[PDB]
Design a protein around this ligand. Sequence first.
Ligand SMILES: C/C(=C\COP(=O)(O)OP(=O)(O)O)CO
Ligand code: F3S
Length: 309
Amino acid sequence: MQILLANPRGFCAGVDRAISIVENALAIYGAPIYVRHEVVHNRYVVDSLRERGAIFIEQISEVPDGAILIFSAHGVSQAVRNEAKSRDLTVFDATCPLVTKVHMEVARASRRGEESILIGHAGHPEVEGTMGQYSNPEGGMYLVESPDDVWKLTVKNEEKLSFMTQCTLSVDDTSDVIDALRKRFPKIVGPRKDDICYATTNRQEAVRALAEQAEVVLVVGSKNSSNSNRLAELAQRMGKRAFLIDDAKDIQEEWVKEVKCVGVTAGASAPDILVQNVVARLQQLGGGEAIPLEGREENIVFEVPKELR
Ligand SMILES: C/C(=C\COP(=O)(O)OP(=O)(O)O)CO
Ligand code: F3S
């Protein structure tokens, strides 16, 4: 059994920055540091920090008075941001700058009264954060997940219409949703393609390449990580067995029994240490040295706020 590793995999720039914001806040002010929602969608990063003294809460009510609060990397709504500010809390915002950029366009559409369509997945926090940038009653903010959702949507003024996308969607399914919007709404405006980040794009291409060599694909990531899910899902629609695993303990040996070539990748929120242990576990079930594929270079780094260095 040959182990292949996808390239790129694992940490993106926004995730590295957000985890570092929490560590450096913890280092500058000591436990406890409150954080709204899991800072990133990874069980291991979140138990890692929860035991360094960070406390993960779901509403700003849960956070005391005079306490330090961090917004997660998935971002937050204007309402949340306001409910925090009017409560005398020190606030640090770990929202990935690639989410912020899409927030800015939403809020631009709110101000000018004009309607906006988000392509994203209901109930995901990035979605809640982004829809909640829209507040103008004159217009609207609408959510679509598929072409069918588009075929049913009606809008006040289809002449002044924009769309935005969640960063961590499938590149292919998103393409079909956009195709649907441009055909129902020939005036709609959005980005030359989508708002999907470079990391989601890259991880997708990489796992596509990996799934054409490997029979089985293991994707390191937590259940609630959208991008990680797109990775497994992509592999599966290529007809490969693919499993989303939190770590080595989840590998069932039947999955790799008699498999000539197994592939490993990692969502943008999964730390390299998890992948290393998954590789050691595969080597016990009979695999050789891990071979990384050639891949597209990533050179983007996002620095923590100056106050947190
Ligand atoms: C913060 C962020 C992506 C980082 O990976 P996560 O696994 O935290 O998030 P997602 O794939 O959105 O569930 C933007 O949603
Ligand atoms: S939105 Fe940011 S958090 Fe990573 S998966 Fe994309 S660079």
